[model samples]
Target chain A: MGFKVKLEKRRNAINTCLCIGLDPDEKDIENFMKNEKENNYNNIKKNLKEKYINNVSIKKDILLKAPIREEKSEEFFYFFNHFCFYIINETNKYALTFKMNFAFYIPYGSVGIDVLKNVFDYLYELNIPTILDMKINDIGNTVKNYRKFIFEYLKSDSCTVNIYMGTNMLKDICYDEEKNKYYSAFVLVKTTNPDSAIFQKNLSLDNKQAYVIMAQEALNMSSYLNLEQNNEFIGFVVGANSYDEMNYIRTYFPNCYILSPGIGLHKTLTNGYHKSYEKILINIGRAITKNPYPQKAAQMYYDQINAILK
Target chain B: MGFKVKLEKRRNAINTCLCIGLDPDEKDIENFMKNEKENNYNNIKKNLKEKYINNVSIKKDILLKAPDNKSEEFFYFFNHFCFYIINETNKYALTFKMNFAFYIPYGSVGIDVLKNVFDYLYELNIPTILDMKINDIGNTVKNYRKFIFEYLKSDSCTVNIYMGTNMLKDICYDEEKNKYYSAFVLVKTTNPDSAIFQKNLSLDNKQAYVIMAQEALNMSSYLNLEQNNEFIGFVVGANSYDEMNYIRTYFPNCYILSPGIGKTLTNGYHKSYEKILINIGRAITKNPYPQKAAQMYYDQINAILK
Candidate 1:
């Protein structure tokens, strides 16, 4: 209930609906540490080539071998922790929230895990909501442990879940529910991947596509738990590229918040579309974060969306 | 293509199909670590109690817990205990399976423990299967693969099918290592309520599991992996009779990793399906003597195999 309320408040008060995706890709980290030594970021790459071409002492190979684990050293974590906050600090104005993908952090080993926990703790201090893009799905017994791990152990505000195990996987999902009121989940509904349609849209269920059945079922069951407006206990991941699949959700599951990646626009903006789209949090990962100038990229997105909104 | 041959060689050599799942539940691990006078006493009593009247197998007080420290040392303790479990049970198992959920809570510390156990299993030459039922679009899946296969060094892992055939096929096996790495695509699971969506999913009145089973077979052939032997496979949870039979009959060539071995074990052994692998987790983890328990389950399984 808390993140939902904050999401709505930020949508209106901040006049932005952007959720920055912070994935700690090793190359991005290696380059960022160098840049601090130095991202849109293409020009930044060009900038780095101009300045640090022969500053040979700070050099570490870009393409690190797999199991790139830093041996029990907090040294790499110093860089890992600092860069993400810098992203938030520079783009804090237009940014509404943040989404942290689990896979990207895994390659760095436990240090990446520590960085995830530390960042969530940092954002909590800032009262910013965080969504863990873990995409976890398991049996009733195993999934409960994951919920405990996600909400309790990691201290994240919310998480994205793969419900192929069925909506039953999220049976105990919530909003302001006594304990972790801010807890929420983003159900993976329509993906825009090249192979997405194979199982999501191809199969039929009582004459409707399987994903449609899944979307409607989720809506029918959880809509009543909404905190009102489009602030839902369970939000949906309807990919920006998969906008054609958006109709039923907007009309049917009207109370749900839609989390879209990048600006899937019929001239869409942060919170609304032409001042009327479902309350969405536009997630942009490498496009902004990897840009030569993230601050300028953030402003550009903010300005373009505002221009469209106006 | 050493992936299939890896299992094939073991299959012929051992003449057994048992893959032990190591899911370290914290409370269970805590119970197993330090409070042993009671466990020894209870064991003495329970051995004659014909599975003790103690409704729950291992009472919390009876098991040893890692020192109540969330300190760096707990990781060392965790590593020592995990190695202990592997030593006790590795002889009976053809492979070891660990899903990320159990190890995720300790954050990076847990991952270290996971890597240590897998590395030890590698030392023992036992293959590891990361039972991560992971599903995402291509980009995310690539990251998951990087961590599981490259970092953890698992032989094969589990995958979810919603992302479609091409991505599933793309997950095929390892190109870098000449070894035949592959995925055990989840078809029908063993949970109680899985039928709610999996069965209702209809195209020509066939269930979703049926379509996915066929999809897994094609994914194997699509990668031309079947010729490599048992590179790609299916995770068919046997909750009851007809389902496992249907899969065994329809897709006989595909290897099946049947989890939830409580009832599935007897049924699988009664039929003696060659390519089928039985995974037992909680049953073995609960006993005070994991080696004894593993040997017991091994005897039960082989009695039927022989």
Candidate 2:
């Protein structure tokens, strides 16, 4: 099945609008090591600085001694691999999809990429829909190479594309029918960040908002939709915080899947606003994954959204 | 020392407005393998298809085969190619530009090359620009900063300012010497059709690029980097000659990194701005004699500057 079809199937299968975000942080790393096998409860109770600073300095020192861990085998690949897998295993049943943030892994250098490959492989095994939240866009050969990395090398079910480089840079953006079989590109239109409105709302193109212009361009590239004409290569990133704006987007561009992040954090977003089994996919990262009972946390978000949608 | 001072020092020392870029592609790989030791030229050229498939069909099947074994080979090849380029061209290179896009396709192997190659550049006392053009917000952006500045140890990086001034503000990191890790914000890019959005008129009726330049200036002002113009720079490509002049006239202190210019368009940009680092990657790397190619470009640019 194509990314859109697969996404719809998953969203309906779980009866959840939630897409779990695996954005690794220092806390994730430390929490994994803390695994509770040590039985050191105070280790968790210690000052946040003391906990965060202690192991990171050790990681810094590893770089200090031998910074270039060139060979992929000669590395930890870190605790996040297992940590993220455990979280995914715990909450996959409730998730419509999964998103991996690129920034957190990038620092680990070779090891980070290796970690992604392993995690991606596991997700592939579980038949879970995956979104590599790379926010990638560039020009010419570089852009093509990025396309190769995302679609071919990593083989993500879907990925996020940023529009900062303008329309020309985004010409070959989304999934290719002849080339990439089951994939799609969710173009960043209206984002979830607090200061996103500064430009996403204000920046104008021919008197239209830049975000609207981006959506139109995205729609333009999404010519090849489903057999029934309900799905397409172009998905959107209209944040949950922008409920009214998302509703406005749905009026004109209703068919494409809207992956709305910031559900658990935003009060308006947590209660749901779209129709049952509609193309709106909610993404919850820290709120679900970081909770003591990850499974319960996911279930709660799943139920809360289902209540409104049902 | 700060990334800005180090870059200026290198620029003054070299006396050539050039930043050599190591953006590895297939040709780079084949060229490296065709060297004296790897000897068989015809075989090297012929075997490229089997080893590296070009088409999307072949790409789909990449996971089916065991491509894992070649990670070390790819890593070493990229690592050596970077070494050869930096060592050969350091005479003319004021700074070396490494794009994360090129190396990333090789997965861990590519990133390993990035980590390994920095030592060689550092040993040569050359500053490196991680041309990521990264755009994100808050915690994610902080992690990006952590990765580029702290982990990879790049002297500087290029950024996209669309995420607003907050991204620009938080990206700047200070070392003990009042030295700051530099970030060059993308304003006017080099692509043929970038103007579709970048040239759009903002609410104030100014072009979007002009707005970007203003934001960059405001970021510089906020950081008190008036004297340290290297801390906050603008990526206005050599593609636009007139726009460069406009940017320089207003934003005098900040440096402009104009990529894809090479030796061909240097004279025009050089006349307008003294700090325009004419960045060339394919022109030098693709050449049979890289060192000679670099020197010839250096001499040509120097002759024009004179």
Report the number of the highest-TM-score candidate.
2
| Among all candidates shown, the one with the greatest DockQ | 2
Model 2 regions lying over 4 Å from their true place: A39-78, A175-182, A194-197, A224-232, A269-278, B36-71, B174-179, B226-230, B261-263, B266-268, B271-274
- lDDT of each residue in A4-69, candidate 1, tens digit only: 676767677567767788876777778877765522333333323432222211112421112233
TM-score of chain A of each: 0.79, 0.80
Interface RMSD of 2: 1.6
Task: Give me the iRMSD of candidate 1, please.
Answer: 1.7
lDDT of 2 at A95: 83
Q: Ten consecutive residues with minimal summed lDDT in candidate 1 chain B?
A: B51-60
lDDT tens digits by residue: candidate 1, B1-306: 356677767766766677888887776656654543334433323322322112211222331342333345455445545656676788888788887788887676788778767766766778788998877666556777777777777788898876566666446655565434578877777666666566777676788888887776776776777666546677878673567777777777667787773563334423344367788887887677788988887877777675
lDDT of each: 0.66, 0.68
State the RMSD for candidate 1.
Answer: 8.2
